[PDB]
């Protein structure tokens, strides 16, 4: 931001924000699968208990 003016900074910013979203969406997607895996184990423990 301190190096580029707004007219073409947003072009560079747009690549960064879309890159981190793909990093962020990957994180939650793997979290959801892991949470399902744990919940299956937690249900198994509850049934076991």
């Amino acid at each position: 931001l301190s190096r580029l003016d707004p007219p073409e900074a947003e072009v560079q910013i747009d690549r960064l924000i879309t890159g981190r979203l793909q990093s962020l969406q990957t994180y939650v997607t793997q979290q959801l699968i892991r949470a399902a895996e744990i919940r299956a184990s937690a249900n198994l423990a509850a049934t076991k208990m």
Partner: protein
């Protein structure tokens, strides 16, 4: 003593306080577009070399 294209003149800049607004009185500046730095945002940056 501006040199030829096949052997251009290379000058290094050492420690100083370079104001990138008082050089406007040196040329009509036919082409002044920059690549990775906003030309307006030049007095707020510290440069390596």
């Amino acid at each position: 003593r501006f040199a030829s294209v096949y052997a251009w003149n290379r000058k290094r800049i050492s420690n100083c306080v370079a104001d990138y607004s008082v050089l406007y009185n040196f040329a009509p500046f036919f082409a002044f577009k920059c690549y990775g730095v906003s030309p307006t945002k030049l007095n707020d940056l510290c440069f390596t070399n």
